[PDB]
Design an enzyme around this catalytic site. Sequence first.
Site, short mmCIF file in Angstrom:
data_model
loop_
_atom_site.label_atom_id
_atom_site.label_comp_id
_atom_site.label_asym_id
_atom_site.label_seq_id
_atom_site.Cartn_x
_atom_site.Cartn_y
_atom_site.Cartn_z
N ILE A 175 0.83 -1.20 0.00
CA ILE A 175 0.00 0.00 0.00
C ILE A 175 0.87 1.26 0.00
O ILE A 175 1.73 1.41 0.86
CB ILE A 175 -0.92 0.03 1.26
N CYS A 176 0.63 2.16 -0.95
CA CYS A 176 1.41 3.39 -1.00
C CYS A 176 1.11 4.21 0.25
O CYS A 176 -0.01 4.68 0.45
CB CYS A 176 1.05 4.20 -2.24
N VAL A 177 2.13 4.40 1.09
CA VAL A 177 1.96 5.14 2.34
C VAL A 177 1.37 6.54 2.17
O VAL A 177 0.48 6.94 2.92
CB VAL A 177 3.31 5.26 3.11
#
Lengths: 119, 119, 95, 95, 130, 130
Positions: free
Chosen positions: E79-81
Amino acid sequence: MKRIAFVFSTAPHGTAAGREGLDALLATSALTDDLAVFFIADGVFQLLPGQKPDAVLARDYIATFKLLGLYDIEQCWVCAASLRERGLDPQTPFVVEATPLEADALRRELANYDVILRF
Amino acid sequence: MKRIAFVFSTAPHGTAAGREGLDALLATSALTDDLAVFFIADGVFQLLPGQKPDAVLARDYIATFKLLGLYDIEQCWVCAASLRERGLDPQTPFVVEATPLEADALRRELANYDVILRF
Amino acid sequence: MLHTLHRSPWLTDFAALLRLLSEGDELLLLQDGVTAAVDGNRYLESLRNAPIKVYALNEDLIARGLTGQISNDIILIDYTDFVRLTVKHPSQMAW
Amino acid sequence: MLHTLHRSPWLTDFAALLRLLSEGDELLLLQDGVTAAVDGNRYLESLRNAPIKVYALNEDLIARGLTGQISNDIILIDYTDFVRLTVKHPSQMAW
Amino acid sequence: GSMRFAIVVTGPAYGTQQASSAFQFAQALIADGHELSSVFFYREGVYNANQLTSPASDEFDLVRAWQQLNAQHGVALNICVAAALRRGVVDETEAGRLGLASSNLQQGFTLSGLGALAEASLTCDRVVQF
Amino acid sequence: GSMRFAIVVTGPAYGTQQASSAFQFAQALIADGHELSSVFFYREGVYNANQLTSPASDEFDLVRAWQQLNAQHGVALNICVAAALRRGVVDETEAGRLGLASSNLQQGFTLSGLGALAEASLTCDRVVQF
């Protein structure tokens, strides 16, 4: 007194708009008899029978359209022009008792409402 | 070795796709020189100068497109056909040094890439 | 190049999509995209005149009750075929 | 009836939108909809031939750098005008 | 024969069908003998990692479906932070730095940078975007 | 002169511009002497009540902007409970019933049924959908 119009303009399952619109429609029907439902553009696809969304892990909320007939939500219309653009049989036994209207007529009917909620 | 193509096809601000696409583009540029950027359909609007999104409370990420020139991301193209459909001056000084390509050429160029990420 | 269309053709920049199709490419209609496969719809002709083969995900036609109204020109496939289609093409342009 | 278009005309069922316009109605372009107000775009003519007045939210043209490329036929308004437009019309059809 | 796949999910757990079709696609490719290297969640795709997601009992629980895919087939769920932060999906550590009283990252998901998207694109045989 | 307004938000805090334009519209109508009875958040609009939303310091904090609108002008911010549940936005009480370890409903927002949408439509002078 305000008359409320619910307009289904999107296809089912790809987006949850139809499901949440139907939910809003039913909750509103409990507070007023002065409401109508319009199926235009891609929303006409909401009316097709035999849909089985569990195939794509989506909720079968189409069945819930049966409550429109059950609880006297009778002002229902479908865009005849839209059905033609989509190659859909105008004689299809829809899941809702919607009577077809040509562009002009549907337009005039919708103009009679005070509030329009599109889904 | 894989060549990666980033394609901007949506207009700016209305949706955050352009912003997040540019972020992905820049992170990728740090791992490879074999990448190209294509601006097609509504994505051509990403290139317009003088945009001031703070007017609608949106982030001014267009300024960040300057980093493409700064960090050698030179394979940049824009769909000439799209600009015409949108009534945009082909001579507009875009914020990115994208050279215009006609349908056929752009199509052939894109086919040279192994991965296509659309935003 | 495998082209994928998950949105209704009526809500897609269809002209932009057609311009990217090249001979040998293939277009898979899935999710709301399968509506473009309905016999007689206004987007069907442009697809037929395109230099490619068009597929439609059966699961999505079943979900929308359209299995018996698909054009003969469109090829019906399942998820497994979808996978093989992505294996066949080195690239995928998702619309 | 005040018609509102917040999406790009290229990603909107434009034919369906036109069919709902009746004389005396007004269409406000906002957000990504303001692209339909660019001089020379392919959707401009259909709008001009429609029996209504078309407006465009200035804030959104400014955000997209299009303030100097708007058709003379389109009326530029701000948020306050937008409000008054909603006060003027008893109903709103949002696209 | 077997190919290395990377899937990109850009739609929510509930709201559109993209994440659902991507999940059905993942199951199909794995069943067909291919390897699912990872699934990268970006844009609205980050909602697939929202632990608080509560579908009705008769609705598909996609968030746990993803967790199960990681648990059973070892598929990495990245998941892209930054995209997650902007949309209110954070893990316990991030919540501590941000001074938030709680977190909601679903067990099985891994916060990561966009570098993981680029790396998957550069090293996998195929990349399929949903 | 003054009209009673009800605004419907169907887009997220971050992701599309709908919620932002609705907020700018709300400020404009209030500034023009009208009354903003309430704002109903439905569909993806429920994300506007996600307390964990963390924009960059140079990005507009819409979630708090909404809270401030409620605090300063008494505008009721109604969130459809069912739509919020399906998308992982719940308050402390709901989290307790669901057995969840935390919650994320932003202070200032009120969980409600669709009946509040219908009531606003039936009693307000105008309804504007975003």
